[PDB]
């Protein structure tokens, strides 16, 4: 549960960082 919740946070931030970074 905790590992899954933390993993989703990393992907969410990673997605935003990728979109912002050209």
Swiss-Prot record:
Keywords assigned: Amidation, Antibiotic, Antimicrobial, Cytolysis, Fungicide, Hemolysis, Secreted, Signal
Residues carrying Glycine amide: 22
Main location: secreted
Subcellular location: Secreted
Tissue: Expressed in mast cells in gill, skin and gut, and in lining blood vessels in the viscera. Also in intestine, spleen, anterior kidney, and blood cells.
GO BP annotations listed: defense response to bacterium; defense response to fungus; killing of cells of another organism
Gene Ontology cellular-component annotations: extracellular region
Cited function: Antimicrobial peptide with broad-spectrum activity against Gram-positive and Gram-negative bacteria as well as against a variety of fungi. Rapidly inactivates channel catfish herpesvirus (ED(50)=4 uM) and frog virus 3 (ED(50)=13 uM) over a wide temperature range. Seems to disrupt the membranes by adopting an alpha helical conformation and forming toroidal pores. Has hemolytic activity.
Name recorded for this polypeptide: Moronecidin
Organism: Morone saxatilis
Residues of the full protein shown: 23 to 44 of 79
């Amino acid at each position: 549960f905790f590992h899954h919740i933390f993993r989703g946070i990393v992907h969410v931030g990673k997605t935003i960082h990728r979109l912002v970074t050209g």
